[PDB]
Design a protein around this ligand. Sequence first.
Ligand SMILES: Nc1ncnc2c1ncn2[C@@H]1O[C@H](COP(=O)(O)OP(=O)(O)O)[C@@H](O)[C@H]1O
Ligand SMILES: Nc1ncnc2c1ncn2[C@@H]1O[C@H](COP(=O)(O)OP(=O)(O)O)[C@@H](O)[C@H]1O
Ligand SMILES: Nc1ncnc2c1ncn2[C@@H]1O[C@H](COP(=O)(O)OP(=O)(O)O)[C@@H](O)[C@H]1O
Lengths: 494, 494, 494
Amino acid sequence: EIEERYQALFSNAAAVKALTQVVANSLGPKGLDAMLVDRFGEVVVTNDGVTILTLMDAQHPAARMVVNMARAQEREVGDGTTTAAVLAGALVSEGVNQILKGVPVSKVLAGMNRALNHALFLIRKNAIKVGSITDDRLLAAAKIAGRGDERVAAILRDAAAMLEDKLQDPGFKLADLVLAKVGADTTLIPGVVINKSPLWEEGSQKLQEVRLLVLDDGLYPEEVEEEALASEAGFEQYLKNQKIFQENLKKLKELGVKLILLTRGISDIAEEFCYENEIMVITRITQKELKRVLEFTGARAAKRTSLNKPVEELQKMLGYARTCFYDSRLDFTIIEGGAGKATATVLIGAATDEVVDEQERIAKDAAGSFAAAYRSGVLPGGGAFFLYLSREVESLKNRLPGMESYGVMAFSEALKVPFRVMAENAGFNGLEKLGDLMTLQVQKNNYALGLDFETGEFIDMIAGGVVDPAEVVYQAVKNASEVAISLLKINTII
Amino acid sequence: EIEERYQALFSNAAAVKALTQVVANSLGPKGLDAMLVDRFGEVVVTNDGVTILTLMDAQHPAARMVVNMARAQEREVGDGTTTAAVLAGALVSEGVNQILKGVPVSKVLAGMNRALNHALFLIRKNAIKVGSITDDRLLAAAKIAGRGDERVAAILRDAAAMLEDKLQDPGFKLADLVLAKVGADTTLIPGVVINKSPLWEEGSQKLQEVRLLVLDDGLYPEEVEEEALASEAGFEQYLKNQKIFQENLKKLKELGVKLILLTRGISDIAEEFCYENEIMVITRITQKELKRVLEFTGARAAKRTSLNKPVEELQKMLGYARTCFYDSRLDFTIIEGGAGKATATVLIGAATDEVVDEQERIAKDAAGSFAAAYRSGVLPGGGAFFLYLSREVESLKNRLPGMESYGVMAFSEALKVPFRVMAENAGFNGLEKLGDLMTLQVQKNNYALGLDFETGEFIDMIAGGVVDPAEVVYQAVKNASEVAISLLKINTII
Amino acid sequence: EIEERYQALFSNAAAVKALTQVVANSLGPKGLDAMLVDRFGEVVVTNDGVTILTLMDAQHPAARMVVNMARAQEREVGDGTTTAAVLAGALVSEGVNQILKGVPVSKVLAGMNRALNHALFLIRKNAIKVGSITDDRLLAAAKIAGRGDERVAAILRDAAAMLEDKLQDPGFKLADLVLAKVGADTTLIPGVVINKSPLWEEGSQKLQEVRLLVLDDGLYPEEVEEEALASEAGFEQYLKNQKIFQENLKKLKELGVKLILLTRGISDIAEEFCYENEIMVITRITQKELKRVLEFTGARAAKRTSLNKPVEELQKMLGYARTCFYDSRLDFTIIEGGAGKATATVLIGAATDEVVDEQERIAKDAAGSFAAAYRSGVLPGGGAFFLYLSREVESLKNRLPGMESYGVMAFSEALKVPFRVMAENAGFNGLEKLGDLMTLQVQKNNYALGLDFETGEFIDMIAGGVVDPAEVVYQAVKNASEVAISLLKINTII
Ligand SMILES: Nc1ncnc2c1ncn2[C@@H]1O[C@H](COP(=O)(O)OP(=O)(O)O)[C@@H](O)[C@H]1O
Ligand SMILES: Nc1ncnc2c1ncn2[C@@H]1O[C@H](COP(=O)(O)OP(=O)(O)O)[C@@H](O)[C@H]1O
Ligand SMILES: Nc1ncnc2c1ncn2[C@@H]1O[C@H](COP(=O)(O)OP(=O)(O)O)[C@@H](O)[C@H]1O
């Protein structure tokens, strides 16, 4: 009859475990996978964790409170979300075990934050900063998210090299430098690209000294309500506007415009006019492509209505853009020599329109990895650094008194969880390889020793081309710990 | 068959306890959060008790009769609600023990009232007056109820020091003098502020001898019914009201106006007029800001119809307000040098627009506390003074006869409950620490000893910078006692 | 159907655990008692472990095999059996936990052995040897086993001073030099004593230069079969034997004998003869008294046939024994100044012939304790050294490879068990006290800090006058370890 006082806590834990016990199947390079079902019998097989974190039917409030945290992680990295997830769940489950033994909650948390703060603090000092831009460690940082095609790693690396100065700019994501096209040849372009064919085509074509205008709109004349097409006067507005459209066309041919970019379609009047005035134009671009060409050229976003300015303000919304080339043998457009910022574009080849959507995603995780690796610093992957963390946390067991000492230890052993799982995924005896490795680390005084989950032999992870970005690990730990804490702060349910 | 006679009592008690066992979790510096659910599956995690009191499905008459009390105190105090709640539940629970043991109900209540009265008298007599409006005890009094935040303490101290004169007016609450701004800097301002930019902005600008008028409205021309605009007379009348509009605008430019304040919009014609006459304008301000500037400048609130006043009685409804300055690099407006009373304004800095609504919640708890701190009367917090109360109540056990004597005793032990819970919230053995402290107070004869619920060693709460205001505890006790009384006077249910 | 392969393990474990869970209640100075039943409805309340180990109806093979260990240590030491019992049971439980976790058996035990060896190594090396025999640490070593009779301690240490040289023969027990007697005065006697009144009363009487003969027999004439009294020749041989008996009596009166010692009865002729020759005699003494006086006087044991010796072996078969005194007002006899071995005699006072039997029980364990304390040296009691052991064993957690490391840890935490129990017997939060003491010990680097299970204050145990003998702890740990080891090698039950 004493169960109620501890009811709620368990009520949460059982749920949390039930979640992580699933994602654990998919963790690590030789992770497994999970199969989700919607009531309509829809079937999905994911091997990536985040997908499963998103799609799994988990209505339990706790699980939700883990999911929100997962969302809080995907916003910052793209890789190593599964890590903080599993870590959270373990911290919860094996965390509560000490509370059940008789250690009161608040005094558990009290030691746990100590463990956390200390963990981060040591991550800071141990975050291996590069001091280079050519380092192989970065290339590998892209490789692991890259899944190991050093081609992608190389081109992304060279690309980031070309723009090292704006790697200091928080208003910049490297992931944006990638657009993939089917059957292309994996390479780099020192400018911005638009994956489209121009309005009228007659083979690969090039223009120089490009005066261009960009529009977040389409090229039709100004509209008035539809009912007004039955009022004759509205018709007079129609003819008048028909005049002012062409007038504005001449206003464009006045300033020497030779190129036009639109997000929609084009009127026949415009098509004919352009056909006559040697001005090239491309339609239906992405709002993101819009943003990129806008930033690169230094132009101003314009629409239909901004045609009424008197040619004097026209020189204020234009673009340049040193050179421009459309390839018919490759079916796309290249803009180079912008007078704004200097973004490039990395293109990746594909087979069908299937892989073509994933290649850029891999590019995103790669570039993001590289970005945080160059910015933040690297820690050894393989879950190996978590072990150094583990023992160096366990150390506080007897440096600070109180029952807090227990909580700390709970934290400590929890940090051991990742590696084992990976190993136990790759088919190893988790305990043998964990104990052997954790013993090995001390007897070699190296926190970088870990396991190649393919051979079975232990190697140096940095030399294995296996590392993680500092901030990724840092904020993974940071969020996961706090969601755990704020989960065990729960006492009751109504 | 005599179990029936007491039925109702349990029906209430069992409910009451079941409620309070939750709120105790929220008491004290290391309280535990609770997880509430609405039947639609709505989820919430709260840590302060008052929040928890509301979503909890408690249709039970007793529970309702406690909720009403808590809500009734937060309406009248603001701090120490969790406390009086728990205390009430305790008086009920430890109250019934004597009734079941064999003490008749009325004879319980009768002594309980006596215990109450004595408690009150002792709170009054032992209430520590400040006599130094600058005293550190007050600053701390703002700190612990606030959340610490030594900035707020400082600014509040400066505010109360510069304005000690209005601590004698009971028709005034200090807490409303706080407004927070995103990215601002926690400081004190000797005037009234509006956190928005005036009608035309460029740089930080200041004007002197400010002629301002206040309006609980906006600057548009006079409106007429939509049907009445279909009578032709409505159009020319529209011209007419526009006429009286222009007349009144010129009537404004007559008086030397340099500033305008509105709670609504502005006519473009009017805006043109103001732009033409070097007149500054602010729109859609807070009504609280309205009232504050109204008091500060000594002006009178007026609206559009009072524009027909003949410029000479209009000159009496105006304001000044010696100086007024808008800062554009911080985005707000400050008015100082009113010729009426001289109220100030406390400014609090923030990170984002999320936290921006929460700091006022600490500020209200802070300032209000300080407000009650000069008014009162400081007592040691930590629930530490309650034990002195307890024992000094137990003293009456054998100086007064009757079975009434029993009721009193119950009362005494009830007072011990808060501290106890605090301890077992902080993860200490409540009975042990209570036992140690209650002896310790006698062996040092100071009612100021309590326990640091973080370290574990006992200190003077005054020396810990941790105290509570008198009046809050006074009516907290009075109310909790009174609801307990009206709860145990219950015999039956129909 | 795969559960059947682990059946035996729990089948034993549950038993061992259930036993030690009982004996633990009684462990330590504030241990509790248990109420044992014989089927006849006989009731027993025990507080000492050994009693409980003996009377408890525990037929389960494992439990029996623990009883065997208790029997095996109490027989070889006398103190510190309860400890090794509890420790054993703990080793069992925390042993199985890792198997349940997944650590395979053999790879656990193999290293557990390493843990043992290192533990022993620490017991040897850290044993503070005395080198002074007068050291207070020894007096205390007797004190803790003594139940707090500084008299017993003092007299024992002074006695040991008298025999520091003969403490080296293991064919000697110091505990035997103590016998307690009703209404006596707790003191030391420089000889061997016999607590009986001789066949002669005269008042307190003293004799010197005693030429004495010792007999593992009685003073009867030579006996002949009752049937042989039907053979006539037996009558005259009986008379002749009656003659030779008195003849040898004269042979005794020849030698200047003044004292006679018998283990059986006395013939009437012998009795009269003895009365006539001023010779004092006592009958039916203890065999232990027999051997000790045999060692002391240097006399030789004799029987019936050795009356036929030709006046030649009598001068060598006698005893001496310089002085001898019988006190009738204290009711016993004292022999001092022997030319043989040099045993002394410690006498302790008592109330009735009941307490006189428990007093000797305190005396034997006391003397034994002191014996091993001088024999090997002392280690700190209070279960305090087991924690040092715990940590210094834990040091091997990452020092040794293999899946084995984990097993070591179990060992470590097992060593933590005693203190906790002690504390939780004394009514403290065991875990809290561990958390405080285990840290306190490291940051002060002394393995001698522990807890006074009365106050709550921590003290130095050697400075607290509370210690254990080295060899005792050594072989206690050794035994518990070996029984645990030999218990977990069990696979099945048939
Ligand atoms: N190819 C690999 N070799 C060794 N370790 C790996 C490899 N890939 C991933 N890991 C380890 O798995 C963990 C998570 O990898 P990550 O790329 O972040 O996947 P996720 O984003 O699913 O967590 C990291 O700690 C990393 O060290
Ligand atoms: N740091 C602290 N030191 C000492 N006492 C404290 C501390 N924090 C809180 N307390 C005590 O605990 C109680 C805090 O709860 P309270 O502020 O009344 O909750 P609420 O404001 O929701 O009513 C107060 O009675 C105060 O005396
Ligand atoms: N007054 C005391 N202060 C500190 N420690 C004590 C005190 N009394 C007993 N102990 C400790 O309690 C334990 C007593 O158990 P023990 O005498 O070994 O039981 P047994 O000898 O029957 O196994 C010893 O380790 C001793 O150090």
